[PDB]
């Protein structure tokens, strides 16, 4: 079960990290300041063409994976007996 | 056809009543389009080809071509330059493309040069949402997404480049190559390789027959190795 | 990126302006990548033109340049013709790298050229695409008005209504990766375009290959079909600044020179293939016939095959070989010519 239980623990891992990242910064002997502030405001109630740059470069990147992909479907040696 | 000497011909081929069969056989001269001849031919090969000839001598090809799901007929009748093939004949073939499940007829007539912003229509759209065997999965979703062209409901109840809509379209109907084909097309690839896998598990456990089931869980391995590789 | 291309070229309409048309040019078709447009003068250098196409659209050097001549087949052309620009052509223009310039309008053998490019792209996967280029005068074109912003980087949504084909305005051609339109200033005739052509020609063709440098000048070949009597002082113009030819069979504007080089029938001869203007165009044939050196014969060939041996037995003609070899990345073609022992 020890690599079953790597790949688990990798994907729990990125949500115990988002865990502590979303929790009031500030230490549990000292933490009712925090819900102090919350419970006042429970009584109250990139760029475009940096996103354009960012996909044209994946999509460089993924035609090289496509062609690379039907380069070694084609040299495979089944192939090639079909095409003999 | 090849063409008094009627009269002969009428009385050593039939020997019997010469006069009546000469007007029978002039009935068919006078609809001469509708005959072909067999006869200087490779004997028992390329039948095809003559068929496609005598439905053109009585005259739409390439949906024929796409019905009888030979994809050699409709290659050859593209590279025929003499034809020059308009907008409207490959906007129809692509239609009939789609609805049946042939995924190299849509690889073909889109490399050929097709506006797909002029194709997809809220007509034709529609059209492909109704193309549902009617025990299915997608058939009772959409049913039940206007008991209260709605495929945004079943998205939420479920969760000028079209290529996307063709994705979800392909994906809802659980159509293997069209969906990898239009994933190759779109952009942005690694977010809708992940939702294309998330999309598929999720009506793959809400799904009756196991076989379908099993079908998608496969498709989903799919996506997710590909924006692995992509990624 | 957009302005200084903005500035450096110029129109003239003669008062010599800054351009408004250039950029990046999409079809209607889907699948498909940009093709790059600019509005020239017709008075300009091919020096920054050249520069301004290999080093900011992004193309590499070419290794040979092609030039298409013809178009007396308007709307059907021969299924000979049409497989020798499908295969002949096109398959040594991508084992070997290079452009093929042409008219980059509809009319002419644009269209079967550029059928050629596409069904070559279709019917393999090479992983790449063939450089075809197109000259075009500013004048001629369908819908020039959907250009006209001068901003600047921007796919122009170029339309084909469908018209009828009148022969005062073109649309262009679809197949193409890169165009020029030269703003000749007369909006109504196809001829103000060649000048600008031949000069570029010369100009690629007095520049070199190789990294740095140190490279054989790179060889421009001309590609001759059918054509018209417009295009004898073409012939005549081209090989006056030393630019090798090679002729086809075709039809008889191509067989005017094929008859006259396998040698009064001359005015025979004159007055049966152009029907038209005898004592001139003659003199212009034996201008052609001063420099019978550089003119080729494709006739008892293979067909659509082994056009890179006569490339070869072009430009020997006009005269290296083992250095065009290396520059074309073949090897069989050196392998050959070590082995014979003359």
């Not at chain 1, 496509?66 to 003999?84: C, F, V």
């Not at chain 3, 039809?251 to 005015?267: N, Q």
């Amino acid at each position: 079960v020890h690599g079953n239980s790597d790949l688990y623990w990798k994907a729990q891992r990125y949500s115990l990290i988002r865990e502590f990242h979303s929790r009031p910064a500030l230490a549990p002997p000292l933490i009712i300041i925090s819900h102090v502030r919350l419970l006042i405001k429970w009584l109250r109630r990139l760029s475009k063409e940096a996103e354009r740059k960012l996909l044209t470069w994946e999509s460089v990147h993924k035609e090289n994976f496509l062609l690379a992909q039907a380069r070694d479907k084609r040299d495979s040696d089944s192939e090639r007996l079909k095409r003999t | 056809t090849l063409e008094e000497a009627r009269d002969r011909i009428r009385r050593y081929f039939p020997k019997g009543d010469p006069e009546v069969l000469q007007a029978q056989v002039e009935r068919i001269m006078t609809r001469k389009e509708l005959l072909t001849v067999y006869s200087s031919e490779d004997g028992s090969e390329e039948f095809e080809t003559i068929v496609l000839r005598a439905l053109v001598k009585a005259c739409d090809e390439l949906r024929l071509a796409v019905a009888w799901n030979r994809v050699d007929i409709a290659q050859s009748e593209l590279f025929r330059g003499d034809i020059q093939w308009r907008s409207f004949h490959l906007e129809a073939s692509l239609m009939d493309a789609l609805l049946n499940d042939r995924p190299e007829f849509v690889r073909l007539l889109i490399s050929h040069g097709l506006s797909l912003g002029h194709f997809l229509t809220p007509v034709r759209l529609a059209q492909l949402y109704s193309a549902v065997s009617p025990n299915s999965l997608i058939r009772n979703l959409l049913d039940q997404a206007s008991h209260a062209p709605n495929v945004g409901q079943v998205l939420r109840t479920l969760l000028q480049a079209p290529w996307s809509d063709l994705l979800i379209w392909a994906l809802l109907l659980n159509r293997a190559q069209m969906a990898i084909y239009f994933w190759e097309k779109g952009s942005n690839s690694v977010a809708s390789a992940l939702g294309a896998c998330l999309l598929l598990r999720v009506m793959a456990r809400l799904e009756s027959e196991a076989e379908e089931a099993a079908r998608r869980k496969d498709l989903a391995a799919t996506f997710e190795s590909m924006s692995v590789d992509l990624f | 990126p957009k302005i200084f291309r903005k500035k450096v070229c110029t129109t003239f309409i003669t008062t010599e302006k800054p351009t408004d048309a250039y950029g990046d040019l999409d079809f209607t078709y889907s699948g498909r990548k940009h093709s790059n447009f600019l509005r020239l003068s017709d008075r300009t250098d091919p020096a920054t033109v050249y520069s301004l196409v290999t080093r900011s659209w992004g193309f590499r050097a070419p290794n040979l340049v092609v030039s298409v001549l013809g178009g007396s087949g308007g709307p059907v052309l021969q299924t000979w013709l049409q497989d020798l620009l499908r295969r002949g052509l096109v398959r040594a223009a991508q084992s070997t790298g290079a452009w093929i310039v042409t008219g980059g309008l509809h009319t002419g053998i644009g269209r079967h050229v550029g059928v050629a490019v596409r069904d070559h792209q279709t019917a393999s996967t090479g992983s790449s695409k063939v450089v075809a280029m197109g000259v075009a005068p500013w004048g001629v074109v369908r819908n020039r008005d959907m250009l006209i912003n001068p901003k600047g980087s921007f796919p122009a949504r170029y339309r084909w209504r469908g018209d009828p084909e009148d022969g005062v305005e073109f649309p262009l051609d679809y197949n193409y990766s890169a165009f020029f339109l030269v703003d000749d200033g007369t909006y109504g005739r196809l001829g103000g375009e060649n000048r600008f052509r031949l000069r570029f020609e010369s100009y690629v063709a007095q520049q070199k290959t190789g990294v740095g440098g140190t490279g054989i000048d790179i060889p421009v070949l001309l590609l001759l079909i059918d054509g018209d009597e417009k295009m004898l002082k073409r012939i005549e113009d081209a090989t006056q600044a030393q630019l090798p030819c090679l002729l086809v069979a075709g039809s008889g504007g191509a067989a005017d020179c094929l008859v006259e080089t396998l040698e009064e029938a001359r005015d025979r001869i004159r007055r049966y293939f152009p029907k038209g203007d005898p004592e001139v165009l003659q003199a212009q044939v034996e201008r052609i016939m001063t420099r019978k050196e550089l003119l080729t014969v494709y006739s008892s060939e293979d067909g659509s095959e082994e056009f890179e041996t006569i490339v070869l037995r072009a430009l020997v003609k006009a005269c290296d070989e083992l250095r065009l070899a290396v520059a074309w990345n073949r090897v069989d073609i050196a392998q050959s010519e070590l082995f014979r022992g003359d």
